[PDB]
């Protein structure tokens, strides 16, 4: 497994069918999940560098269809993190006075402070998705909100934000087993509401925006394809990609001002 | 042994000095540790009734002296929730801003919302506890503050808002030696500052104001003193307070208004 070939390359532009939905590397669900486990350890070590060090952030962005695993996605792998260093907004329909804001208003409120790791569950990108699928705002429109979801996910790179959007690929069938799955058990009854399937009847409108919405992927700001129809495979896949991340951020303890051989204890 | 036994029980005042600090309720590190890590799965589930509910949220109210372990009891205690429906706020040295708003404008701004876990490390009681040491405010001025916490928890708790206020009880030789074991181990330099000794060296002062502060110990919102010296038996005690706080609040999953046998996915 390279978890790069799952990297929407800059300038590339994208059509999901080329990308699987149901990948294994070549692993079982027990090998992967035994690995999944391992690096847990490591992203709760490194996230603790992070939050001890104060200079850096972590901004993942989750964007998804119904019943693609971003809920079980940050119980799994997000749940490895202290709760204490972590952030979660998951956004919803905008509020009255959300919408009297420019669109990112209510995004960069969210944005993560120095030492933590931010999850967007749904988020910018929301404003040019569902808002074209069913035309409440123009492609016009959509562009120039594009060119400024660019301009301020540069802002939060230049202010040490290191930003990883990710998205979780099903295919069709997958999702109705799911969601009849849901339908099926007398305790999911509460996930499940009359409008998942409204989008689902969009299924190749939502394929052409995030298309769109993908070429916003750069160096410094990469998007993810994340093949999820194995539920161990999202989870072990989302785990390298933060992981990975963290490395390469390579937050170092802080420093002191205070000799400790000096000090005694009354 | 009886965590009701650690209940600050109404209306009688208590010397913090009858609470033993290194309490195990007859079981050792292995057998206790076995039984932290079954009832995370327990405060999983009840967690996400809690969230999935929306009707009711859990607000862990955490006060301690340094290396007490404030920070290793939400690490493991609060890690077993789903970080997605938990909030954590560390109040630091009010700001500018909020001194500028009486002191529980900043404390109510994070008060939780409907299906939320809040913990409050470090809280309102800050502001008549360090305050009142170092002669920041007087006693009228106190008495009058513990008055206002009341009548604020009171707000919360006819939100269905459950409080629950939790001190960490330590001897001072167990904080002396972890203090020391950070000057010792080089990679724990970064978490201990001389500044930190001022507090201890007033360790009599805090059990006035302490005493005093659990005067507010009420059915709806009461204070528990957990012997921390076992960092192990801390973090049981503390699994025991919430879980059964979370089974009394009782959440359900929601109903449904509409039949799954009817609908047909496409």
Redesign the interface.
Known sequence: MDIDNYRVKPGKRVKLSDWATNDDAGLSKEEGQAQTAKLAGELAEWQERLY?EGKQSLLLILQARDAAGK?GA??KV??A????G?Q?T?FKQPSAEELSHDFLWRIHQKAPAKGYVGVF?RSQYEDVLVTRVYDMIDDKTAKRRLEHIRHFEELLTDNATRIVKVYLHISPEEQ?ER??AR??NP?K??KFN?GD?KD??NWDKFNDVYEDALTTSTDDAPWYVVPADRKWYRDLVLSHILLGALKDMNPQ??????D?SK?V??
Chains 1, 2 share one sequence.
Do not use: C, E, M, T
Request: proline letters at 11%; zero cysteines.
């Open positions: 001890a809920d940050v119980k997000i749940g993190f202290n709760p204490a972590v979660i998951s569950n109705k969601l009849q339908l099926d305790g009854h509460w009359p399937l689902r009847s303890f802080p420093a002191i001002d205070y400790p000090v204890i009354h």
